[PDB]
Design a protein around this ligand. Structure first.
Ligand SMILES: [Ca+2]
Ligand SMILES: [Ca+2]
Ligand SMILES: [Ca+2]
Ligand SMILES: [Ca+2]
Ligand SMILES: [Ca+2]
Ligand SMILES: [Ca+2]
Ligand SMILES: [Ca+2]
Ligand SMILES: [Ca+2]
Ligand SMILES: [Ca+2]
Ligand SMILES: [Ca+2]
Length: 584
């Protein structure tokens, strides 16, 4: 009973030169009725796609590199104003060149360079096409448990044509590393353009060069950590990067040792997430802590003002079960039916008003997947893994609303990876895997092997199973032979963060409902946006117009990046998915 704000997008038309013709795909928008159809136009407004639809891709045999495409929606037998016009890509990726920052030297005395790291997307200027907001990582970035000085964290915005809109420098008082800066790109106020929200400090320099706080404060200690001095929360304006408003980060660190160590590990474990706590409009949550004291703080940014909505603190009375449950990521989804978003903080959940929903007591894990994994169960499921060898489960498949287990598997050990996806059509729903085994959504062990990666799942070819993504590979589970075969190796491109091996971004940002992959070139001279050329016979509303998925894109960069999920069941046997309840 609720419509959600959702980004006004253009048709997302993309064309790609293939052996034999040109491949084309476009969006089906969530503002459109299911009855819509399309005609495709090659060059001189030539109708080409003679009758109409059932998908939003089309293979054009008589297409060449000099061709120009437009598509026209048909609303009730009446063709509409054409889309934007596009040329043809001579390779299966779009190059976005980067203004790569020059290296530098820390007090350390050491030298360091930058590489393109985690990304997000948003419509910063309102033209109906996504920009890429990119985090730059210095080669001396640090995990929380490693001493050492780190280079400045920088965040750029780029249009798809390579236009660099601005650079923000977080400055010397924001340590570089996976668990420090978590950045949220969303249209919070509803003005139709996106803002950026993240944690700042004395000396962060906005996109117009304006310094926040004291440009001469240096709270870096001799171990390269910032364990003193004030802490800020800032939202910047999308098209310019300018400070809009800055408030005090909550909670502040206080006595560092109260978090469970004196050397600055547990205290600087951060997460963040966009959530429609309204059921209608976006909020965001900034989180601090998970091994230990765990605090979530929710906000709105509307009418130029940042307002605190609520605070959940595990130190607070009655909330002590909720400590030690958080993962190195979070999920966001209406799990209880009320139209409003709850926060699935790893092995615990917070309700939309700031109140504990449940704590499983199974403890912190390094991966999680929240979606409709078993389409035979109404409601969502959460499949995750757990670090605690003394946990009853090393992998657990539970009810997302109550937190009660559905099935789970005792390992007496850390299980540091786990995945969820429909890779086997013999079993309706998503299969899951971790710690040497592959299971049905019901908990039954399939075969004896498992896919060659346990990282990301990506919808890439034309079928309803999901494919696999790791390093610079897209792979496919051959469920008949129990082997992983390769569909694409993006040679020259590279993933990020060594063993995590994640892409800068995975997201349906162009064309068809299939997902695009944003990998950096090895030297970080360009980002590459890969889009599929597999003709599909399936049609769906753009994944960026689904609530759970869009919010998945917004937290992908967060902590140890996890892959996105749809709020509906996407896989073999799915129903023809219905128009989403949204406005633009
Ligand atoms: Ca834009
Ligand atoms: Ca806005
Ligand atoms: Ca809800
Ligand atoms: Ca609720
Ligand atoms: Ca961990
Ligand atoms: Ca379900
Ligand atoms: Ca399946
Ligand atoms: Ca597929
Ligand atoms: Ca796509
Ligand atoms: Ca990350």
């Amino acid at each position: 009973a609720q419509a959600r704000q959702m980004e006004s997008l253009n048709r997302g038309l993309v064309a790609v030169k293939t052996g034999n013709g040109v491949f084309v795909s476009w969006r089906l928008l969530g503002t459109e009725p299911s009855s819509v159809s399309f005609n495709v136009y090659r060059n001189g407004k030539k109708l080409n796609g003679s009758p109409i639809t059932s998908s939003t891709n089309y293979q054009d045999a008589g297409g060449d590199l000099n061709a120009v495409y437009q598509v026209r929606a048909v609303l009730n037998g009446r063709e509409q104003a054409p889309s934007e016009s596009v040329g043809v890509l001579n390779k299966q990726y779009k190059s976005v060149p980067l203004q790569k920052p020059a290296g530098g030297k820390t007090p350390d005395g050491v030298s360091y360079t930058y590489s393109a790291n985690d990304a997000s997307v948003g419509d910063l200027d309102g033209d109906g096409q996504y920009e890429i907001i990119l985090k730059w990582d210095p080669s001396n970035s640090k995990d929380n448990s490693q001493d050492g000085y780190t280079g400045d964290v920088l965040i750029d915005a780029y249009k798809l044509d390579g236009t660099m809109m601005w650079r923000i420098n977080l400055g010397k008082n924001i340590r570089a590393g996976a668990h420090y800066t978590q950045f949220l790109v969303y249209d919070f106020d509803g003005d139709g353009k996106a803002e950026i929200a993240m944690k700042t400090a004395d000396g962060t320099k906005d996109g117009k060069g304006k310094v926040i706080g004291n440009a001469n404060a240096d709270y870096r200690n001799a171990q390269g950590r910032i364990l003193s001095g004030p802490e800020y929360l800032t939202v910047f304006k999308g098209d310019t990067g300018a400070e809009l408003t800055t408030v005090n980060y909550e909670p502040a660190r206080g006595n560092v040792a109260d978090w469970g160590d004196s050397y600055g590990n547990r205290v600087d474990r951060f997460l963040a997430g966009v959530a429609y706590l309204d059921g209608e409009r976006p909020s965001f949550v900034m989180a601090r802590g998970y091994y230990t004291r765990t605090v979530l703080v929710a906000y709105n940014f509307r009418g130029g003002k940042l307002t605190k909505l609520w605070t959940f603190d595990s130190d607070a009375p009655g909330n002590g079960a909720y400590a030690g449950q958080g993962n190195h990521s979070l999920s966001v989804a209406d799990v209880d039916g009320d139209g409003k978003d709850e926060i699935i903080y790893g092995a615990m959940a917070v309700d939309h008003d700031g109140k504990g929903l449940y704590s499983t007591g199974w403890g912190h894990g390094d991966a999680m997947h929240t979606g409709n994994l078993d389409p035979s169960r109404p409601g969502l499921e959460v499949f995750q893994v757990h670090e605690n060898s003394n946990s009853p489960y090393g992998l657990s498949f539970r009810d997302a609303k109550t937190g009660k287990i559905i099935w789970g598997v005792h390992a007496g050990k850390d299980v540091g990876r786990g995945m969820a996806a429909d890779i086997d059509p013999r079993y309706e729903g998503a299969e899951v895997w971790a710690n040497g085994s592959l299971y049905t959504a019901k908990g039954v062990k399939i075969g004896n092997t498992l896919p060659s990666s346990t990282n990301f799942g990506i919808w890439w070819d034309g079928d309803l199973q999901r494919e696999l993504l790791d390093s610079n590979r897209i792979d496919k589970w051959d469920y008949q032979n129990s082997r992983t075969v390769n569909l694409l190796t993006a040679s020259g491109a590279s993933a990020n963060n060594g063993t995590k091996a994640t892409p800068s971004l995975q997201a349906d940002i162009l064309g068809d409902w299939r997902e695009e992959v944003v990998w950096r070139a090895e030297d970080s001279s360009e980002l590459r946006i890969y889009t599929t050329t597999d003709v599909t016979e399936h049609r769906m509303y753009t994944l960026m117009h689904d609530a759970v998925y869009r919010l998945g894109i917004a937290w992908q960069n967060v902590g140890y990046n996890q892959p996105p999920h749809t709020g509906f069941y996407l896989g073999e046997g799915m129903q023809t998915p219905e128009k989403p309840n949204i406005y633009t």
